[PDB]
């Protein structure tokens, strides 16, 4: 087939990345608020959560999508947006170990929820590719990350739409891209005051021209398994699920305080601690930064430190 | 009132509008959202019903079996291995003529665990004697819920129904839905009154052991009920258009078939994708069309025979793994070829198996399907009866 | 509110289980069904999981029940009952019926209560439906040609446990005690009791006591099977009374954590006097009898039967 | 279809017995004779009536045999429609049971009984195509074997022809010669009793006698099989003909305690101002009422003693 | 081996005994119960050394043998009617995990109401599950198919579970002559069970991990290829069975008087033998009729039927089942035959006969009326209706 | 035999549950699986009924188990675990394998143990297979989006039991006590115990004690669920200890009518100190809290916990 034959020239794509459980709802609320604001403008819209990311786990990267067009959407039944025009990061640490910019189209915008400088973020990204704008908004200082058991698996959310950080972040998206009218976005969120803070206080930088950025079919890829899908048992590690990129924080040890009681070691659900003659050794390849080891450490040898504090 | 809701929520409103008296829940992806919404509706007093927490799918149908025999309008649902776990209860429900409605948000059967959708799960129940059909949109998931209660609970029918909808693609993905008013449904859906019921004031023995001699009369009796469904379904689809303003064809949702040479025949949400591809091809001059099957059981043999015997070649999409079946496609290919058998030398038929494990049936794949069909239309020869996409096409 | 029955003289004359069924001459479960139906009265709906008291009673295309009755799968007796209770409580509340709330009774065999029907039973007790669940125990899968069940006694001959060189006792396993399986762990459980056809008045009073409960109730009834156990058809009541007198079956009400013995027996006959009269035990050796005697003594002590075992 | 698919040289045997207590011997009779005929190069088929399964105590049950010189083309049926040999393992079966339905000219009825032939004839009335009636006292030569083995198609671990099946089958051969007596002896567990039956059997030749849709079935079957709850009795299963014996009460001994009333599994006892009334339309003669009576007012009496 | 008059149940048990089955899971349900009673006797009398597990239900039965087959044991279980549908959830896991479990099915009508008579409805419900499936018409064939399906199923090129089906009562209960083979013959015919995965701590494997939709098609297609390779292996088995046991089976169609037949009746199981009897009697009248009995139902021999049955003027398909709402309103066999013979749809006329409902006997007269209909259709080339329900419509 | 573990420091270094699984950060059941695997050793076969510890561990097409593992339906964990045991006994007796008899362990969730898997569980106990059946209890159907289960506490919030004006507490039903359900009526049952991830050494010791039995054993392990119960990921161990310290979960061993308590609490905190930390109970009024306290007091008295209830 041809991309020209099934082209939808007036279709906009939005991809939101978030942390599972703790921020998945706001991810949902961002794409829901924008589609409800666009529908008010007489446009054809579609919002949904990444089905393969379901069920979301704590701190696992999860996605929510939006498709907004002035013409009828002839591509409704998909799993993901193949070519995002807007990429949104609900949590800042998602600039590490996660393909957030894969597929982005020219003139695109990246919006990040963070208190850290734009320059700091751009040092973690590296290749900005087809991006035209990098945007930061301190959404955590404007609202709270909402957590509910409602609105899951397609059911309606009983906590409404956009009461938390979804509102300032969505407000920041609009000021950068103008994807919908801000006054329409105001009418669909439960926290319009925070939204207007995000709209007003977001910082937008236009990136230097990238004329050598390339122009695939991501969702057409299959993955074949062995006989009957049976796999050999791992010996030391399961590389089929590397969970290091779940971290928003990591445990740092003060070994002069550590008594080597190995209380942390027996309680780690992910087996990331190994006993040594030098004391406990933490596996950063798989560590999810859950913080249990820090919480059970009785000597205070362990402390949680934000992931972006490390040049790793 | 038009809202952007999932197929799950769409079904829930249909149930709510039906004023169902008994519901039995149990969780399984991707139908779970249906019960969650229903659970909230009962909690908020949006619906007065007994919300029974079933210990499993087998119990779900069983609870729903007894409640229906007690004269209550009932609802339940499941997905994948849940549908097959309850398999034992389906025929008892049908044979006792209890118009139970079971919503099915499709999902691939084990093994291994896969949340993606296939029509395989609901198609295992095709012999069970239920009314069966697939909704391709969230709007139709609601509409079919109302229609099937009307047709199913009809005293000329009194048969259980499978309200099917594609997993995720319909059940999860949000879509524009016109939610009917409580006044419209009251004019469309009459109260459930069966020919038998458990009542100490008119005591009846429901389902006594029979000898083999009594076998043929009973099986033929239910058969006469199954054959009479189509007529009742025509009345309900006409009545739905009048009251609600949406005109559904009781058998085939046809698109650009008037002067089409080749078409794609199938069911479910992936058919809506096929229409889009067909329109794009029409913009290139290609005389291609699409026929979406709205009624899987009772299968519309004669209706299909009259309406689809005007095309050179017909491609049948089967979003399922019906292993070992004749012509090695899926069920729809086998049942379409049976229907057009008299025209087997003129109308070429070929099977397309795709969307396995819940994968997307893409525009590209539909394009390659239409192109394969054109080659068949030119040559009049079918090299092999089925193509398993993308491996073989 | 069903009144207490003082005697056979004070028992109701009305039969709701009428003559005309293909049940064995001297069928224990048949008398069970008659007695239970007699006590239940007209405002009653019976649920019949597949078994003798379904097939033997309904052959062919007929039935002896004067009140409503519906077939249930052997797997779902409790679930089918739950739905009927749910329907009636819903229909009455929603003014869609003017019928009064009926007695709802499940007449399940041991297989459909202890084995393949346990899951549906336990869940019904958990949800606390207003249902009386009754198990008639003939200690086998009778209607299928007498096969072993979890209530089949140790060393009992069935077509699935035949005595041979490799397994002399025939059945190795000791039976499951269902009344004690369900008596604990289910908070909504209002009434648990065992009964016997040997004591008919006690049987009818226990059935009524359970029906008077506002929640679920479970009654385990010993119903000797002259076919399966292989004793003369005119010995069924004799076998019922010997079972209680030898401790092979214990009559009690379990309420609020303590057993209340229903029948006062001063001594106890050795199990030999009970087993010698049924040919399902004819293959057993005195060493096998001893294993049975010890198992029974433990059973009797568990419910508080502390009387001496005295030979006749 | 009658003439076209006819198998004229095929023989049909119908053995009637009481369920549980005698179904083993009934099975053994048709098994012994077919196994014997197979030794003579005959095409044979023996089976138990499937619709009579599972057998209940004292219910009339059947076992069939088909023996032909040609391959049996009517294997896959349920029952013999035109019996040439009718065997009754229990004598009370001559009462209220269609034992002679469909019999053909030259047919033989064989009855296990101590009673005379003339008495048996009184219950039968018009024997029609029946040409011979045979009586044999199998109860004196062997016993009714009872077992849980050999049920529902499974093999019997008690063997073949150990009980009253051997003397009965011997009485069959003595009248029909359908197999060789030595072949029958070679396939039974108890040949000694077999030869006794083959010897002591009494045979009378009856006087000269002259030779003797399912769409409606659809029309008969109610909605989903649902039937109304009966008020007084279930006439779909009349069980009076199960009796090998009946309870007889002595009104001089009866105390009207109605102990028997509460223990009858078939609700055949009604409390009246004149005492207990027994329902002989349904009474199975199980004998529970007799076993529980405190006054000894009840006695079990052989059914054929009552010519009602 | 020794010829004896035995029921199909006992015939199956002997097939199981000779197979040296390692694990057997039992549960009673008429008319298949006798198979387990006979096996329980063999284990009790020391005729077979196997673990005899008393499953608490049919769902549990298939689950037990699921686990046992994964641990490397050759397994056997079976059921009837609602027992087959009760264990429905486990069928697909067994095949997709490539565990060559064998399940015997003595057919019985599904509820409601209670009915001990046979229909093929119960077993035909499992036709999508990805198992090998066929119907035995004689007690002899029941034993033989037991040995055959183990070899084909446990074949390392196949590794698929098998349904060995036989007509309830008619085959399972009615005694018939059976040639019980020797242990030396079976050991020559049936190799020990070896799979490509097993549960063994020495060589740890993870069997059945959750997959994503992207992994869907390859795994499904992987099983699709295994299914299409069955026919080749089945042919190699039937030739081996003829060379060892002296009985030569056709892997697809048991044809009778079809060489010069103008109309034939197509179906499977015991009632087809009666069709052969009626056909032979009708030949004496001048009616040139024949019978085609399907030996293998899954995987459906689509092409073999296309080149072997396309030479008749009319085909009457017997469906001893209640496949409600199906296309052409006959049964499954009719729909799949018409699908197979689609190319010759103008020439070869097809009609479906539904009979034997609720276990009712399909009489000689009924078969005669079927042949008379086919005779009319062949002459006129006109099918007034695609199905006839016996005896109400024909 | 597997001998006792004396302490954390004297625990085995070996991990048979390796890093790399899509489980929530701070996942209670994940730690349960790790401790169980560490205690069981290399001669072990895990049976995983469908649930979080199946799906979350294997997503996608991989697995963390160093020992053999096989998928089981949520309906047949006990039956699947009956087959492998039967297979291994037969293959060994018939000399078809040189493998040794392995530890056979079921890791079912509460749903697959107390609800939809109970029947298969109870039957396995009846047949007396040498199998350890473990229930990890996160008190919901977690993988499907946190739905109510029979172990789900009263008044708890799930997507099937949301708080509304009709049902103010969300869930009206009180939990089913599955450890007590199966502890009676099953003569073959060797060992019944409850455990908690809060006491890892105690947990592992109970596993090994259960494995050392030559027969069936059942262990009910309390494993807090940060997603489902809605509490911080690093508070998992704190929640587990508070569960025991408030009597919401009891630690004991049940040997022949005797409740052998595993930990010593001199005074248990009120339920409110445990429930206020979870958002699943955030809707409950003081009138509901009292009802919970009354239930816990009865639960604790039943196992002999008679210490006073004293606020912190
Ligand atoms: S038990 Fe005996 S004394 Fe009492 S009423 Fe009956 S016949 Fe009369
Ligand atoms: S939902 Fe609960 S059990 Fe499941 S992975 Fe998350 S924390 Fe673990
Ligand atoms: Mg759980």
Helix (H, G, I), strand (E, B) or coil at F29: helix
How many CA atoms does the CB half-sphere of A240 hold within 13 Å? 26
- If one counts the domains in chain E, the total is 2
Residue C15, φ and ψ in degrees, nearest 5: -105, 125
Are the CB atoms for A99 and A56 separated by under 8 Å? no
- DSSP label at residue A308: G
- For A10, other C-beta atoms within 10 Å of its C-beta total 12
Rounded-to-integer distance, Cα A118 and Cα A131, Å: 14
Residues E315 and E234 in one domain: no
Q: Which CATH number do you get for residue E309?
A: 3.40.50.920
Residue partners of F126: CB distance under 8 A and separation at least 6? C150, C173, C176, E56, F186, F188
B284, B383: one domain: yes
Contact B81 F161 (CB under 8 A): no
Nearest in space to A285 (alpha carbons), one of A274, A272, A276: A272
> Could you tell me the CA-to-CA distances from E331 to B214, B341, C131, E386, F174 in Å, in that order?
20, 15, 42, 10, 49
Cα–Cα nearest to E173, from D64, D26, C157:
D64
B113 lies in the same domain as B225: yes
CA distance readout (Å), D223 to B95, B131, C71, C190: 10, 19, 15, 39
Query: What's the half-sphere exposure (Cβ side, CA atoms, 13 Å) at E111?
Result: 28
Q: How many CB atoms lie within 10 A of CB C93?
A: 13
Which contiguous run of DSSP H or E holds residue F205? helix F200-211
C113: left (phi over 0), alpha (psi -120 to 50) or beta: alpha
Give CA–CA dist C168/C173, Å, rounded: 13
Q: F281: part of which helix (H) or strand (E)?
A: none
Ligand 1, atom 1, lies closest to the CA of: D293
Q: Are E175 and E41 in contact (CB under 8 A)?
A: no
Domain that holds residue B240: 1-249
Q: Whose CA is nearest to atom 8 of ligand 1?
A: D254
Calpha distance E379→E374 (Å, rounded): 9
One DSSP character per residue, chain C reads -PPPP-SSSSS----SB-S---PPTT-HHHHHHHHHHHHH-SSEEEEEESSHHHHHHHTTT---BSS-EEEE-TT-HHHHHHHHHHHHHHHHHTTS--PPPPEEEEEE-SIIIIISSHHHHHHHHHHT-S-EEEEEE-SSBTTTTSB--TTSPTT---SSS---SS-TTS--SPPP-HHHHHHSS-TT--EEEEEETTSHHHHHHHHHHHHHSSS-EEEEEE---TTTTT--GGGHHHHHHHHHHHTSS--EEEETTEEEE-S--SSB--THHHHTT-TTSTT--HHHHHHHHHHHHHHHHHHT----B---
CB D55 within 8 A of CB D17: no
CB B229 within 8 A of CB B150: no
Q: Kindly identify which residue of chain A lies nearest to residue B360, measuring between CA atoms.
A: A78
The residue among B249, B273, B303 that closes a domain is B249
Query: If we measure between CA atoms, which residue out of E97, E38, E27 comes closest to residue E61?
Result: E27
Here the tokens at position B19 are 């004023």
Helix or strand or coil: residue D51?
A: helix
Phi, psi of C298 (to 5 degrees): -65, -40
CB B98, CB B65: distance < 8 Å:
yes
Please say whether the beta carbons of C176 and C157 come within 8 A: no
In this complex, is the C-beta atom of F116 within 8 Å of any C-beta atom belonging to chain C?
A: yes
Q: Are F53 and F29 in contact (CB under 8 A)?
A: yes
Query: Are the Cβ atoms of D217 and B216 closer than 8 angstroms?
Result: yes
C-beta separation of B252 from B311 below 8 A: no
Give A139's Cβ-side CA count (13 Å radius). Answer: 34
* Residues in contact with A248: Cβ distance below 8 Å, sequence separation at least 6, in sequence order: A19, A59, A91, A92, A93, A289, A306, A307
Same domain membership, residue E300 and residue E225: no
State which H helix or E strand residue E53 sits in.
strand E51-54
Distance in angstroms (rounded) separating the CA atoms of residues E319 and E269: 10
SS3 content of chain D, % helix, strand, coil (to 5): 30, 20, 50
Number of domains forming the structure of chain C = 1
Q: Do chains B and F touch by CB distance (3+ pairs < 8 Å)?
A: yes
Q: Name the helix (H) or strand (E) containing E352.
A: strand E349-354
Which stretches does DSSP call E strand in chain A? 11-19, 44-49, 61-69, 86-89, 108-113, 131-137, 203-206, 231-232, 249-253, 273-276, 279-282, 302-306
Q: Enter the tokens of residue A189.
A: 């969120």
Is E241:A247 a contact under the CB 8 Å cutoff?
no
Q: Taking a C-beta distance cutoff of 8 angstroms, is the pair D50, C59 a contact?
A: no
Distance CA B343, CA E342 (A): 8
Ligand 1 pocket, CB under 6 A: D 249, 254-260, 276, 293, 295, 297-298
Chain F nearest-CA distance from C212, in A, is 21
Pocket test for ligand 2, best of F17, F24, F57, F278 (most atoms within 8 A of CB): F24
Q: Is the dihedral of CA C158, C164, C168, C171 positive or negative?
A: negative
Expressed in angstroms and rounded, the spacing between residue E262 Cα and the centre of ligand 2 is 67
Angle between helices F200-211 and F28-40 (to 10 degrees): 50
Coil, strand, or helix at residue D3? coil
Q: Write the residues followed by a gap in chain D (C–N more than 2.5 A).
A: 212
C-alpha D292 to ligand 1 mean position (Å): 8
Q: What domains can be seen in chain D, in order of their start residue? A: 10-205 (3.40.920.10), 245-305 (3.30.70.20)
CA distance C122 to chain B (A): 9
Residue of F nearest to B112 (CA): F71
Hey, is the C-beta of B206 within 8 angstroms of any chain C C-beta? Answer: yes
| Chain B: residue whose CA lies nearest to D216 | B217
How far, in Å, CA of D202 to CA of D198, rounded?
9
Q: What is the largest CA-CA distance in chain B?
A: 70
First to last CA, chain A: 42
Query: Do residues A265 and A280 make contact, with C-beta atoms less than 8 angstroms apart?
Result: yes
The C-alpha of B95 sits at a distance from chain A's nearest C-alpha, in angstroms, of: 34
**Token digits of residue F252:** 């004991």
Task: Indicate the residue among E210, E229, E250 that finishes a domain.
Answer: E250
D234 closest CA partner among C17, C312, C285, E355: C17
Show Cβ contacts of residue A179 under 8 Å, excluding neighbours closer than 6 positions: A12, A14, A34, A38, A68, A86, A173
Angle ∠(B61,E360,E171) on CA atoms, nearest 5: 95
Sign of CA dihedral F210, F216, F221, F225: positive
Burial of E177 (0-12, 13-18, 19+ CB in 10 A): middle
- Interface A:C, ≥3 CB–CB pairs < 8 Å: no
| Tokens representing residue A176 in the block | 């950068």
Q: Is B289 on the interface with E (CB under 8 A)?
A: no
**Atom 6, ligand 2: residue with shortest CA distance:** F24
User: F225 a known binding residue?
Assistant: yes
If asked whether residues B22 and B160 sit together in one domain, one would say yes
Tell which phi-psi region holds residue B207, choosing left (phi > 0), alpha (psi between -120 and 50) or beta: left
Alpha carbon of E144 to those of B387, E231, F286: distances in Å?
Answer: 35, 17, 72
Question: F-chain residues within 8 Å CB-CB of E66?
Answer: 76, 79-80, 83
Residues E98, E31 within the same domain: yes
Buried b (16+ CB within 10 A) or exposed e, E330-360: bbbbbbbbbbbbbbbbeebbbbbbbbbbbbb
Q: How far apart are CA F301 and CA C152, in angstroms?
A: 35
Q: What is the DSSP letter of D92?
A: G
Method by which this entry was solved: X-ray
Question: CA Rg, chain F, in Å?
Answer: 19
A231 to chain E: closest CA residue: E206
* Beta carbons within 10 angstroms of residue C189's beta carbon: 20
Between β-strands C258-261 and B131-135, what pairing exists: parallel, antiparallel or unpaired? unpaired
E257 DSSP 8-state letter: S
Domain match, E240 and E347 both: no
Tell me the CATH number at B223: 3.40.50.970
H/E stretch holding E104 reads strand E102-106
What is the Cα D267 distance to its own chain's centre?
25
User: Which residues 6+ apart lie within 8 Å of D126 measured at CB?
Assistant: none
C-alpha to C-alpha distance for A170 and A166, rounded to whole angstroms: 6
Query: Which residues form ligand 2's pocket by a CB distance below 6 Å?
Result: A 57; F 23-24, 27, 29-30, 52, 56, 138, 142-143, 225-228
User: By the CB < 8 Å criterion, does D51 face chain B?
Assistant: yes
What letter does residue E386 receive in the DSSP assignment? S
Cα-trace Rg, chain D: 21
Letter string b/e over residues B209-248, b meaning 16 or more CB atoms within 10 A of that residue's CB = bbbbbbbbbbbbbbbebbeebbebbeebbeebeebbeeeb
Beta pairing partners, A136: A112, A203
Contact F150 C123 (CB under 8 A): yes
Query: Residue A270: its chain F contacts at CB < 8 A?
Result: 19, 21, 23, 30
Helical ranges in F41-99 per DSSP H = 52-58, 77-93
Number of H helices, E strands in chain E: 14, 15
Q: Are strands D130-136 and D107-112 parallel, antiparallel or unpaired?
A: parallel
Strands D298-302 and D245-249: antiparallel
Residues of F with CB under 8 A from a CB of B: 50, 54-55, 58, 71, 73, 75, 115-116, 118, 141, 144-145, 147-148, 150, 159-167, 170, 173
Residues E36 and E131 grouped into a single domain: yes
Please state the three-class secondary structure of chain B as a single string.
Answer: CEEEECHHHHHHHHHHHCCCCEEEECCCCCCHHHHHHHHHHHHCCCCCCEEEECCCHHHHHHHHHHHHHCCCCEEEEECCHHHHHCHHHHHHHHHCCCCCEEEEECCCCCCCCCCCCCCHHHHCCCCCCCEEEEECCHHHHHHHHHHHHHHHCCCCCCCCEEEEECCCCCCCCCEEEECCCHHHHHHHCCCCCCCCCCCCCCCEEECCCCCHHHHHHHHHHHHHHHHCHHHHHHHHHHHHHHHHCCCCCCCEEEECCCCCCEEEEECCCHHHHHHHHHHHHHCCCCCEEEEEECCCECCCHHHHHHHCCCCCEEEEEECCCCCCCHHHCCHHHHHHHHHCHHHCCCCEEEEEECCHHHCCCCHHHHHHHHHHHHHHHHHCCCCCCEEECCCCC
> Three-class SS of residue F204?
helix
Looking from the CA of residue D293, the nearest atom of ligand 1 is 1
Q: Residues 6 or more apart from E24 whose CB is under 8 A from it? A: E16, E36, E39, E43, E50, E51, E52, E53, E75, E76, E77
Do E313 and E294 share a structural domain? Answer: yes
Resolution to 1 decimal place, in Å: 2.3
Q: How far is the CA of F27 from the centre of ligand 2 (A)?
A: 5
Q: Which helix (H) or strand (E) holds A294?
A: helix A292-296
Contacts 24+ apart (CB under 8 A), C9-14: C9/D258, C11/C38, C11/C200, C11/C201, C11/C204, C11/D262, C12/C38, C12/C39, C12/C41, C13/D270, C13/D271, C14/C38, C14/C41, C14/C42
For residue D253, the CA-to-ligand 1 centroid distance in Å is 8
Q: Across the interface, do C279 and D56 touch by the CB < 8 Å criterion? A: no
> Considering CB atoms only, which of A222, A228, A233 is closest to E214?
A222
Residues 6+ apart with CB under 8 A from E159: E98, E99, E100, E153, E195, E196, E226
Dihedral angle, C-alpha B93, B96, B97, B102, nearest 10 ° = -10
A 249-308 residues with CB < 8 A to E: none
Q: Is F222 in CB contact (< 8 Å) with chain A?
A: no
Task: Please name which of B215, B171, B148 lies closest in space to residue B80, comparing C-alpha atoms.
Answer: B171
What is the secondary structure of D94-142 as a DSSP string?
A: GSSS-TTTT--TTEEEEEE-SS-HHHHHHHH---TTEEEEEEE-HHHH-
Name the nearest CA neighbour of A283 among A232, A236, A240, A234.
Answer: A236
Option in F126, F150, F295 nearest C150 (CB): F126
Specify whether E224 is located in the same domain as E160: yes
Instruction: Please state, as a whole number, how many other Cβ atoms lie within 10 Å of the Cβ of residue A4.
Output: 6
Which two tokens mark B113?
């665990």
Domain span at residue F172 reads 1-312
Q: What is the 8-class DSSP label of residue F128?
A: T
Q: How far is CA B59 from CA A232, B54, B86, B227, in A?
A: 37, 6, 7, 29
Closest CA to D218 of E353, E386, E390: E390
Strands B2-5, B22-25: pairing is unpaired
Nearest ligand, CA F224: 2
- Residues in C touching F180 (Cβ below 8 Å): 184-185
Q: Are residues D231 and C20, on separate chains, in Cβ contact within 8 Å? A: no
Closest residue in E to B57 (Cα) is E89
Q: Residue F103 in 3-state DSSP?
A: strand
Q: Is the peptide bond before E387 cis (omega within 30 degrees of 0)?
A: no
Region for F132 from its dihedrals, namely left if φ exceeds 0, alpha if ψ lies in -120 to 50, beta otherwise: beta
CB atoms within 10 A of CB D203: 16
Top mutation candidate among F17, F21, F22, F23 for ligand 2, by most atoms within 8 Å of CB: F23
Q: Of the residues E250, E270, E295, which one is the last residue of a structural domain?
A: E250
For A201, B44, D41, D124, D183, the CA distances from D179, given in Å and listed in that order, are: 109, 82, 11, 27, 7
Question: What are the DSSP E strand ranges found in chain F?
Answer: 44-49, 69-72, 103-109, 132-137, 191-196, 217-222, 252-255, 258-261
CA of B81 to the centre of ligand 2 (A): 22
- The Cβ of residue A204 has, within 10 Å, a number of other Cβ atoms equal to 16
Instruction: Give the separation between CA E343 and CA F204, rounded to whole angstroms.
Output: 67
Torsion sign, CA atoms F183, F184, F185, F188: positive
Residue D177's CB is within 10 A of a number of other CB atoms, namely: 9
E265 and E219 share one domain = no
Together in a domain, E90 and E121:
yes
Residue C204's closest CA among C1, C2, C5? C5
E200 Cβ contact list (under 8 Å, min separation 6): E72, F68, F99
């Amino acid at each position: 087939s041809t991309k020209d034959l099934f082209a939808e020239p007036n279709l906009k794509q939005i991809t939101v990345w978030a942390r599972g459980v703790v921020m998945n709802k706001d991810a949902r609320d961002i794409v829901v608020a924008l589609t409800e604001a666009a529908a008010k403008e007489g446009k054809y819209v579609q919002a949904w959560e990444n089905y393969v990311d379901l069920p979301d786990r704590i701190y696992v990267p999860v996605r929510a999508y939006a498709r907004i067009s002035s013409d009828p959407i002839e591509s409704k039944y998909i799993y993901e947006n193949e070519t995002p025009d807007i990429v949104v990061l609900v949590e800042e640490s998602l600039i590490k170990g996660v393909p957030i910019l894969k597929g982005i189209r020219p003139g695109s915008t990246l919006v990040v929820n963070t208190k850290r400088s734009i320059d700091t973020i751009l040092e973690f990204l590296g290749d900005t590719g087809n991006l035209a704008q990098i945007v930061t908004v301190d959404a955590n200082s404007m609202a709270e990350a909402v957590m509910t058991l409602s609105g899951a698996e397609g059911a309606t959310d009983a906590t409404g739409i956009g009461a938390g950080i979804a509102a300032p972040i969505a407000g920041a998206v609009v000021k950068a891209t103008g994807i919908v009218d801000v006054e329409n976005l105001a009418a669909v969120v439960k926290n319009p005051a925070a939204m207007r803070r995000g709209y007003a206080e977001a910082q937008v930088r236009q990136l230097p021209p990238h004329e050598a950025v390339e122009e695939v079919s991501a969702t057409e890829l299959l993955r074949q398994m062995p006989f009957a899908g049976t796999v050999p048992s791992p010996v030391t590690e399961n590389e089929g699920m590397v969970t290091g990129n779940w971290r928003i924080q990591r445990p740092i040890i003060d070994r002069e305080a550590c008594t080597e009681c190995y209380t942390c070691w027996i309680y780690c659900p992910d087996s990331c601690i190994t006993r040594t003659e030098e004391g406990p050794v933490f596996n950063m390849k798989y560590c999810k930064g859950c913080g249990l080891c820090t919480a059970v450490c009785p000597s205070g040898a362990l402390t949680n430190v934000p992931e972006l504090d490390f040049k790793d | 009132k038009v809202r952007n809701i999932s197929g799950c929520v769409a079904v829930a409103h249909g149930v709510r509008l039906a004023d169902v008296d008994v519901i039995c829940s149990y969780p399984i992806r991707p139908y779970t959202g249906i019960m969650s919404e229903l659970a909230r509706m009962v909690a908020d007093g949006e619906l007065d019903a007994e919300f029974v927490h079933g210990e499993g799918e087998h119990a779900q149908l069983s609870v729903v079996y007894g409640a229906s025999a007690a004269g209550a309008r009932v609802f339940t649902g499941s997905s994948g291995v849940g549908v097959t776990y309850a398999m034992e209860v389906y025929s008892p429900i049908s044979g006792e003529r209890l118009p139970v409605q079971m919503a099915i948000a499709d999902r691939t059967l084990d093994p291994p665990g896969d949340f993606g959708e296939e029509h395989t799960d609901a198609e295992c129940c095709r012999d069970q004697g239920w009314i069966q059909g697939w909704a391709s949109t969230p709007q139709e998931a609601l509409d079919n819920t109302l229609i099937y209660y009307r047709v199913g609970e009809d005293q000329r029918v009194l048969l259980p129904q499978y309200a099917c909808l594609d997993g995720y693609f319909v059940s999860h993905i949000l879509g524009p839905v016109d939610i009917p008013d409580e006044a419209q449904v009251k004019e469309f859906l009459p109260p459930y009154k069966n020919h038998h019921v458990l009542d100490p004031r008119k005591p009846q023995i429901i389902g006594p052991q029979i000898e083999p001699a009594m076998g043929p009369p009973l099986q033929y009796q239910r058969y006469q009920a199954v054959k009479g469904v189509h007529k009742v379904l025509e009345e309900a689809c006409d009545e739905f258009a009048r009251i609600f303003g949406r005109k559904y064809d009781p058998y085939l949702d046809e698109y650009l078939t008037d002067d089409a040479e080749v078409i794609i025949f199938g069911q479910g949400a992936h058919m809506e994708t096929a229409k889009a591809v067909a329109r794009r091809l029409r913009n290139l001059g290609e005389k291609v069309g699409v026929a979406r099957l709205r009624t899987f059981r009772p299968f519309p043999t004669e209706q299909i025979k009259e309406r689809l015997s005007k095309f050179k070649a017909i491609g049948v999409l089967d979003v399922s793994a019906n292993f070992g079946i004749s012509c090695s496609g899926g069920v729809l290919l086998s049942e379409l070829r049976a229907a057009l058998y008299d025209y087997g030398d003129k109308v070429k038929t070929v099977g397309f198996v795709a969307g396995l494990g819940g994968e997307v049936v893409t525009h590209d794949e539909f394009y390659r399907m239409f192109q394969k069909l054109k080659e068949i239309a030119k040559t009049g020869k079918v090299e092999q009866t089925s193509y398993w996409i993308p491996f073989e096409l | 509110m069903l009144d207490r029955i003082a005697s056979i003289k004070k028992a109701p004359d009305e039969e709701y289980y009428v003559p005309g069924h293909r049940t064995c001459a001297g069928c224990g479960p048949a008398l069970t069904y008659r007695l239970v139906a007699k006590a239940a009265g007209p405002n009653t709906i019976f649920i019949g999981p597949t078994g003798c008291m379904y097939v033997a009673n309904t052959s062919y295309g007929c039935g002896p029940w004067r009140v409503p009755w519906i077939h249930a799968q052997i797997t779902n007796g409790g679930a089918v009952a739950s739905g009927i209770e749910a329907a009636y409580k819903a229909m009455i509340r929603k003014k869609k019926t003017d019928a009064e709330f009926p007695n709802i009774i499940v007449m399940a065999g041991d297989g459909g209560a202890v084995d393949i029907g346990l899951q549906a039973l336990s869940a019904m007790l958990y949800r606390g439906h207003d249902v009386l669940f009754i198990c008639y125990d003939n200690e086998s899968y009778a209607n299928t040609g007498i096969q072993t069940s979890p209530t089949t006694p140790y060393g009992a001959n069935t077509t699935f446990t035949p005595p041979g060189e490799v397994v002399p006792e025939g059945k190795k396993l000791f039976p499951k005690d269902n009344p004690k399986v369900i008596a604990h762990g289910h908070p909504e459980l209002k009434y648990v009791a065992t009964a016997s056809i040997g004591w008919p008045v006690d049987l009818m009073n226990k059935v009524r006591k359970g029906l008077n409960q506002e929640g679920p109730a479970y009654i385990h009834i010993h119903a000797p099977c002259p076919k399966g156990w292989q004793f003369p058809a005119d010995k069924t009541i004799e076998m019922a009374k010997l079972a209680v007198q030898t401790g092979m079956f214990q009559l009690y009400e379990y309420e609020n954590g303590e057993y209340k013995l229903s029948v006062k027996v001063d001594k106890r006959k050795p199990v030999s006097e009970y087993m010698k009269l049924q040919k399902r035990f004819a293959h057993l050796k005195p060493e096998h009898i001893a294993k049975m005697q010890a198992f029974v003594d433990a059973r009797c002590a568990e419910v508080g039967i502390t009387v001496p075992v005295v030979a006749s």
